[model samples]
Target: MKPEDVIKEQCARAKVVAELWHGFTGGAPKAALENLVVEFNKAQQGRCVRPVPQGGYRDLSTKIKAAFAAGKVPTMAQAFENNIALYLEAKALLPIESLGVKLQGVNLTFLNAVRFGGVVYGVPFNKSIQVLYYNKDLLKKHGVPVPATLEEFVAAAKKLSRAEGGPVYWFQPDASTFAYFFFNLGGSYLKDGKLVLNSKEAVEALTLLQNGVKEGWAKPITSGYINQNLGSGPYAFSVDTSAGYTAYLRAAKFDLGVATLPGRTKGQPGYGLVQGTNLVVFRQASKEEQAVAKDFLEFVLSPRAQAVFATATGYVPVTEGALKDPVYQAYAAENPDYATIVRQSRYAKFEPALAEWEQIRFDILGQAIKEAILNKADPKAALDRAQKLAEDLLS
Candidate 1:
């Protein structure tokens, strides 16, 4: 039977009502899961699964694990990248790979994010990468081409800001944003399996960003307001996820142009980090349950479904065959702007997978990076403190 029919039949045979508990932070997961439910009901002769939306992934994973421990786990749970490591550490997730042969044309970078110690633990539904969103009209009016390097980015930002009666635009920096910057400069938080956030490369990149804010080329925006003000035309350019293109288009009140984040120096590879969640099954689930989960995963990677999903959301399709789907092809033709993401995917890097990375990122690295940019601390000293904090946490 088809996957949807199988789920409905399983529910009927067991006389067990199933509900899909989705962790919705108001983005792609909500839309994708809702679409899946609609398709499932249509295919299952009108049977529908109830969906319960909750807070962030960390909280959702805790609740779901508790439910499983009490023998009340939902039929499915949505998980983010950071929480996947936690779920795997707790031995609370089932491997979804055994249900079928591996999906044939999915993006390897995305595949890597859901993997732990070489084991496939989840099926990715949404994959996001950093992209530079520039106000094309604003930049043209200011006579600057798309920037090709970090130096040019700063120069362009300055030029754009200096235009006659130009609006004040600042290159807002954040932890996730700095992660992208450091990666593009060939610096990594972990090198040779050792934490290396205090390296000269790390300091150099951080300093460049700090200098931008200090020199008035960039400024800080409250994290909550970053998205709201990103494309409002005051900011000529900013770094954000490719998945945010639709929001930028709507909020800009005009067409926006996109490009890959520039590298640190010419000839250096420009690397961007992938952001978003993956879907994983629980280890406590039965072999039969894993098989069922795998079947649904295959459905997720199917060309038709991928096209529908990628088009509805601005995520890059994880499956290679998704690019060949007529729906995807048409969407691409109509929205050439998305091609920047497709072309830049070759340089996308999976974020650090260390278990303590989430905390190190949010509490330490993120805060330190902001301090440096806002002139609260020198870049080198700020990063040094962050590095020590991360090492202490890891130890």
Candidate 2:
């Protein structure tokens, strides 16, 4: 029997359409998800997963919170690690186990995005990691090879600069970006249940970036996308999420190169920071809708569906089977840049799953980067203040 026919035979037993409302964010990723929904609806008969875009993440988050208070929530929604923690506290989420869904062969790093307190709460979708994006032309012009270690990375930044002009690296003043370098530099989020924002590694990580700014080769962007600067000019390197692949491809006028984040020293363990959302079912959903959500979730994790989403949107596939799928293999062959992304999957890591991380990540750590790198404060002092503020926030 044909594939759709097989699906029809299985779903024909239900003979009823169970519509599921999936609250999600808007933009290119939404458009890509909409196409997946279309394929999902075509392959199934008993359920329909509707993609309801609620503007940006901030707007979607606000609406999800409001819906919970109003006692009217979608069957499922996209959520970050921090958001999942909040929903868990409110008892607003359904564990993946309740749906009888077993996450198999998925990327463990991505799985950690929604695994809270040792329970899987959501399925990884649209996940990405920070990769070093460089301008091939610029690197060649400056005669600097792709950097493989922290020292070489800084050396390239210095070599690629001019006496007077824009900087070589557009260092984003954000927590995830900082965490990318910090973690690779041997920094840890917590030590002995206390925030380690001012440890030796953390200080060195910030100091490295600060020295770039101090010596006039790295420009810290307080706002806006680094891809914009990358496409326009002056900046040669940026550590950004892999999901921005489509954007970077569209924006770049030069030959773009993708590489794994550099380690502290050659051959040392290089860690990547995972960023992106997972699909979560709400406790408020009806039993039937929840079942449909489970089916849809499984379909999403299927090799074909995973291939479709990853190829279209530049997000990494969650499973090894998806990578081996013919659809993704073709894309991989044509776009060799993505190989770097796949390589990093072995060592990529996720942020802390604590609810307090939302504040610590944004309020404390993000501000510390600005104070130290952009404003020229002492890295140790800025991060020391960060440690105090984060402790207070946790307390």
Candidate 3:
């Protein structure tokens, strides 16, 4: 009844080793996650899963695309929502049903990331939300209260400033966020299944933020650590991924606070993009490899595995099992700051994971933000131009 002997006997049953190419690297958290994968390989007697780390997430996205174009995707991959959409468009992913994967707690919300017209294509893994991180030291000094509404968020930033020098808030640039702010303002990305970014709501979303820049309340910082931007000077607030809570805590010597992105009215529904990756089986996987991959996927969704993944990374667990467990509950009790994201999960929204959306979000919507916020171009005109470009690309 030894573990090794049991696994050896199971290996005699002829399941292929499932290969997972991933983007899990940076520092100790990723390294710990890697070790968890190794633990799965050693412990799972029914199916053996092997981890193949592929640098960072950005590099891994490019590598996965190149692998597909070259006609040799691995048995499995760790993919973002957009990456999964690309695989679906290429007809390159295997549906979980084909492998008979009967995993647990895979409710509709978790499935939205990989669900197409009507099939589950991937399993939810590490997921996160975006939020505003503010410096409590600065907010207190300026006598500004925590903003509970959209307009107040902008106003508070204005008060947290000096007569001269850098602005009080740094708006992080993220192309994908256009959809989040739009949704918060009751705007839709599509109309009759066509692009529609120049609507009145879209104008409202951009204009409100741009007014902050025009009024000298906030400035845009294209890229950098949000904490560094906050710590640099008078800049008291910045938008960032909740996954950075750990680094933010360690970096800030002063008081740091977290807040949800606000809506037009207090307690009205608001949203932040739920950021995460998924595990997908490639179409190229053999029948045996596919079976093993499914079993590994189930293991990944298991309570034990999710606990390791969720706690290691700041991503929230997809299932209630992990949170209901004593260990994770204790962890949450101790770290209330990171817990804010888990609580924010109630308002989380997935990005429009369409294949064509990738480039349009980058070249068009991203440019629109820059044109309006930085260059002081008219918000409606910049977004109108972006809408036209998006329609052309989507068509």
In terms of lDDT, which candidate is strongest?
2
Cα-based TM-score, every candidate: 0.86, 0.89, 0.87
The global C-alpha lDDT for each of the candidates, from Candidate 1 onward, is 0.70, 0.78, 0.73
How big is the positional error of residue 358 in model 3, measured in Å on the Cα after superposition?
Answer: 1.4
Clashing pairs in 3: none
Clashing pairs in 2: none
Off by over 4 Å in 3: 1-17, 44-50, 53-58, 162-165, 228-230
| Residues forming the 10-long window of minimal summed lDDT in candidate 2 | 15-24
Cα displacement (angstroms), candidate 2, residue 207, comes to 2.1
By lDDT, the candidates rank as 2, 3, 1
Whose TM-score is greatest here?
2
Model 1 residue 161 CA deviation in Å: 1.5
| Candidate 3: C-alpha RMSD after superposition | 4.6
Residue-level lDDT of model 1, residues 1-395, one tens digit each, is 54444445545544223355666666554666567655644453333454566676556766776786787665556776677786677777766665563755778878777777787777877777778887788777767888878778878877766663343344455666877777776686767889777788788878877766666666567665355765443667777777776666766764588887788676753687777667776665555555445555666788888888777766778888988999889988998876677777777876677767777777888888878876569888998999889988988
Backbone clashes under 3 angstroms, per model: 7, 0, 0
Ranking by TM-score: 2, 3, 1
